[PDB]
Symmetry: D2
Subunit: 472 residues, 4 copies
């Protein structure tokens, strides 16, 4: 066929579905799948990310994606009316710097954000904390510096999904509400997709955007098991709160990224609601429910660091979702060794933000183009990337471990932190050396592996050895 099947009905699948449907009105595009958010670019900057070449490449793509959002939103709202609600919930972001965290993360990351803004010539301003709208922190948890980032905003993800579905149907797209079980290929070319109702759908192009299940789906094809990097579940907890007085901030309020890619932010919503997020934990098997620990940490941070009024506010919903966490720390975007087989996944914290750029990239590739410059390193069929030295990762994992203390925030005898830093180094060095002679997992995954069962560690040692064998 010249038929296109999109596997996955999140922001990535629907965004690629909309772009394909709008760009090839002559072809049938079918999308599979059943029934905050920050547009994070500069707010996502860390010293550690920008210290690596792969990190600077990923950041450049986030900055490119940000430029597409205003026209993208206009093109999606154009297919609806006033009563559909607004996709955009804020235009600007304030980054707050407080002392409820590690200096080695929060101080370094604040300086890195300021530098990245200046280098990109982005509009921004360091502002007086007193000039920050709405916030009412605990004085012992208050910010002493604040950074206004202009044109870095937030969307209502529910209104975005509704606008994407409406836009998909308007462009002639077909929704088939079943899951893909299997991609069929032979003679190095896609034939189509078997669905979980036993049916077969033919296609000339299959775009896999099935979140954390994307690699498991492609890895079943010959040789691909050790050629497509594994994706794990980055379980994230957020909450919808009805504010005591129905108020909200005019901007996103956030810290820089914190221990193990968690962070604190408040995204405005319409109708007296605020979104608060967000925890992150890489889990070696999926989990569908928030832990007690995750809910307490999120609520405690927001009530102390953002607004004490949230303490008396009504909890409407605890939300849980899986960030696709790629084992080498970078997304899987583009073509494979199988003609017509494409992947858009492993986007972790910022697949939603990158969605309009990733959609256009894959559509360009499908049309014989080269899409967006600088995505080549993030091709889905690859040896695991080694974006950092083992030494860099070992420094990072110990700093992030210590940051879980300072972010609590703990109160300990003053000799205890130095004692724990000293005694953490050995076990993480030993683990890294045992896992592989060539591959080192990023800190977020290394902590999950450190505290997993021996059987799960041994399975990863085997995985890493099978990848080495395949690519060397």
């Amino acid at each position: 066929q010249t038929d296109v099947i999109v596997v996955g009905n999140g922001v990535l699948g629907l965004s690629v579905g909309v772009e394909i449907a709008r760009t090839r009105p002559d072809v049938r595009v079918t999308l599979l799948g059943k029934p905050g958010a920050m547009l994070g670019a500069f707010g996502e900057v860390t010293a550690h990310a920008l210290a690596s070449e792969h990190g600077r490449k990923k950041h450049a793509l986030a900055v490119q994606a940000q430029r597409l959002w205003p026209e993208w939103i206009e093109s999606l709202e154009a297919t609806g009316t006033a009563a559909d609600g607004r996709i955009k919930t804020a235009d600007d972001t304030v980054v707050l710097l407080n002392t409820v965290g590690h200096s080695a993360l929060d101080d370094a990351n604040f300086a890195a954000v300021l530098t990245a803004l200046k280098e990109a010539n982005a509009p921004h301003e360091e502002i007086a904390v007193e000039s920050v709208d709405w916030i009412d922190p605990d004085p012992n948890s208050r910010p002493l510096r604040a950074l206004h980032i202009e044109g870095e905003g937030s969307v209502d993800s529910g209104i975005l999904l509704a606008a994407l579905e409406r836009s998909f149907l308007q462009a002639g797209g077909r929704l088939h509400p079943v899951d893909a079980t299997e991609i069929r290929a032979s003679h190095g070319r896609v034939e189509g997709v078997v669905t979980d109702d036993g049916d077969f759908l033919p296609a000339g192009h299959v775009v896999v955007a099935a979140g954390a299940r994307s690699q498991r789906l492609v890895a079943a094809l010959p040789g691909l098991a050790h050629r497509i990097p594994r994706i794990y579940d980055g379980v994230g907890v957020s909450a919808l709160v009805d504010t005591w007085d129905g108020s909200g901030p005019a901007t996103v309020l956030r810290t820089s990224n914190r221990a193990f890619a968690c962070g604190l932010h408040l995204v405005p919503r319409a109708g007296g609601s605020v979104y608060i997020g967000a925890t992150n934990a890489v889990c070696l098997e999926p989990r569908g429910a928030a832990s007690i620990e995750e809910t307490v940490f999120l609520f405690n941070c927001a009530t102390h660091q953002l607004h004490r009024g949230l303490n008396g506010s009504e909890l409407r919903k605890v939300q849980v979702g899986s960030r696709p966490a790629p084992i080498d720390g970078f997304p899987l975007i583009g073509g494979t060794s199988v003609e017509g087989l494409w992947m858009l996944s492993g986007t972790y914290r910022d697949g939603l933000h990158m969605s309009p750029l990733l959609a256009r990239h894959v559509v360009s590739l499908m049309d014989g183009g080269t899409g967006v410059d600088g995505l080549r390193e993030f091709r889905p069929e690859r040896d695991l990337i080694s974006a950092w030295s083992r030494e860099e990762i070992l420094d990072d994992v110990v700093r992030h471990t210590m940051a879980t203390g300072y972010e609590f925030p703990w109160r300990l005898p003053l000799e205890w932190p130095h004692m724990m830093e000293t005694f953490l180094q050995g076990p993480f060095a030993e683990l890294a050396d045992r896992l592989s002679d060539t591959y080192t997992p990023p800190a977020d995954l290394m902590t999950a592996i450190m505290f997993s069962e021996r059987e799960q560690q041994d399975e990863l040692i085997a995985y890493y050895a099978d990848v080495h064998r395949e690519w060397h």
Copy 2:
């Protein structure tokens, strides 16, 4: 007609249907059970565990405690009679036989130390089987050492039920006895909220925290039936990290403003943790952030650190019917009422059901319930001075239970500066009536308009009864 489909309404519905097979009994209320206390309950069959020094210092408190001890004796046969109408696959109502009461220092000495001694004394006086045990012998618990118990009390035959399985068993038993479930609400004494009129010779109001507002519309009854407010309670269902649970109820004594910490075992790798309490002058159907954090923080530190890594399945919110004079509304009027049971209507349900059915049959029911007749002047079970001591102690207890860390001069400074404003409030509200601490704190922090409305209410009650 029984108005209300909580434990009290269904329990009285079952007893009426089983006892008068010749009469049509219809029970009103919807599956949503808005603000429903019963589905938010663990629930503990709390008798001795509910004892406080403050309660047992009043005659009315000792009367309420005696009724709880009597109710406990009915539970085994009551459960047998409810499970008899079902099969194995309906699940078990009883979730535990025994209770361990823990004493730790994450609270006020003036509540927790006094209440532990009062529980021990009440057990000995009632000749109840119990034992002070080594904390090391308490199974399953894994507290933070800085939050750990140093004393523990095993109470034999004081257990817990699954409130959801209890409600299902009561409904099934009600239908088996020929009862009719009509899933609408009463608007007026019965006119229902679909505009219909249902005729009846008897109306039993067991509508939880809405019960007094429903009866108060009838001539003169606005100042003759004591007000009932919403004691908003937050609890949670947690799937434990390893699917384990304790063999017993684990609890503290009742704490600041009738909150408390407990874990009730459930089947299938779940535990119930509770429970916050806040008297609200208007109903609230959602947990606050503060309530969720306090509940989770207490359970993870004082009971089991493993709960920290456990999955949150459900945050539950219900309204304890909070009577303005601190005692239930049970019996006949100048029409019957079963309400204002606050923390222990579920536990007392089989006794209260049999009491009201006896009254309806021309009997005198259970001897000591006369003071708790629903049509009454507000009870004054304590002196103003006793309540002012209590409200300041409970206010300070919200600090010690957090637990806070403060400069050592601050607690005495706050005790001194709390006394005046509470004395001023009590004197302003009425020359004769004093609200119990739980309600006094809610009034202290309410709008001036809400305070003035209560001053008028108290004055209208005085005028009616004096």
Copy 3:
């Protein structure tokens, strides 16, 4: 006589003694006071040459506060030549008076936003208005400090030419300079000032002796007003001075290091503050608590030692935790009841006062000494110091409303500075319940006078008999001046 007796051997007494002795070589100047220096503020001081570092929003919101600040800036200009003139009378082995040239002010979140944020902005504004050399610097560029990350500063301010002196070396240099100028040290205390026919006759000492004098300069720190108040009518004409009891410590650092600059916060709850003053020889000074007491106290409380040490180890350097405690020091800041110093002449011919300087008499000492010596010589001394004449009705530098807002903020600041951890509703509840009792106290004390916050908190928690005695005092002052 034309004899001069200086009563008191702190920085103010010795500084005025040196200036008198140097300026009137023809007269006998005798300085009273003992080596023990009981309740002595000066030996307990670091000490900071605090001008811009002492700026608060509250001080600079009052006319009297802006006047006192201008005098501190003027005093700073005298220090280099003053130190040169004092070291000149000694040799290399006497050691150096100056211990630092510059000050870093740190801003952290271990305190009330309503004090620390307001005061940091006020310091920056005062520096800009005075065209003083200064720079907001990256916290990472602050040398030596090693704070707890949860207690770390996020802003820092380098103040150039605002430094520190060793108060012990200063006192030794002043005594030596006093003797070099022909002064006589008599190590006894004054018990009584003798006056008749509106003129000083001299001083009875606590060994029973009588010393004659044409001039008596009272610089007896917190005892100064109690000494003069015995003279006819002066009990209600010289504002009361109380004890601002201050705790500091000398610490031998783990590695013998110290910072190159003063390290400090802005002034905090009830005029306490956190600072580290460099010393020679592997020692640092840490200070300093403040508590107004209605009676003198010569020993640190447990609370004061814990708070000082806890703040320094978390906010400045965790290495201080393992450092050796050499000395806990206690002195009395002379705390004037109306919040301003007592400097100049009286209705008694030849009777002068130099006191009530609270936190900054050591810094102002060379200016105050020259002012009083000018007055004694028939001059007008320094222009803005006439308002701080010792014989006066109590100053009312703030409205009752301003003081009531201040006392509640400072009370709440004692929580945030601890720092406490409380349920989030508790602070608002305590703010609400503090307002009434402080308003009631202020209204009860007097219809016209309001004590500043530092003294109002001491009175709030004093005995009923002490409150009633102050009500009588305020009524007697009103009667005398109205």
Copy 4:
């Protein structure tokens, strides 16, 4: 006469001096040591007559621990007549040695369950086994205490006839009793013990003098082994004694009150503990920190003062917060490297040792003094003190595994005693990551000797050079005895 020199003027030196002088009309007895009592344990002590209060599960799990406990119980019986005999040489104005008859042991949650819960049960068991008079009492019945509710005890144990002495009044009474019995106080320090032909000749003092003697008794606290170790072969034959640096304080209470009994916890992390010992005249003693140091230290650290004050104000009486700090005291508990005292004779004729008593030499003093004096007179002294002879191979009272479990528990206890507030996963993570480094250190130090936990933590955090010197020491001891 046949001269005896006692080296050291603590409780052990003076107690042996008194017994010799009273018992031996044939000997001239001279006692060395200065009034300053540098590093002196005795003057820093409260002191508790600790027998049952000193019981821990860990001590009573070893044979050597049960032997030491039996001796403490025996020592208690001697105190009433000993005190009578010392006060007899003075008058009313000298003050009373005994300050309390009874002890209350409190159990709170400001500590590790693995120490405080185990130790409370061990104390109860030891009391019952000895048939000692005692009673578990309601906490509400404990007089005087006013703890923070979050730091309060939930169990309390009254121990009858286990009391306290004023260590200062004891030292004064011992000196006076020594002089009355014809003893000579020579206020200089020994620099060197002179011996030849396997016999003591006497002592070179730090004023350059030589004092001849037939007997030298070394009771120089933590300096005792370093003084004897210079003699041929004795460096590896007398177990090392380190400084168990202890911080205590004298506090004048806010109202001049005090408790009628000793108030204490069981022994806590690394042999620290919390106690209040009554004193006369509106004073209380609070103690006491412990830290084994490889070199002597004569000053409290900031950390030690904060921890001691914080524990006492929260766990015993909040009124201490507002009380006046009169004195911070520092002394060295003689900490033997093998965990047991050094009491009796040596391979050198006339050379005796009384040291390494750590926490309870003052309590054991009358028994230890009589033991050594009996030995000097050709007697056999007290049964069961032979195992603690000073010239010995290091004792191994516990398995390496027992000590490794103990050191990790004690390390974790430093967190719970603070008390810290941490994420709930952190303690298990720290327990896991502490095991490896302590196992590695223990294996590296020696194939045969394991230092007890108190010393192992000090070695773990010492310089590499200090660790290597101890590896050599242990190897030289092995070579000498095997």
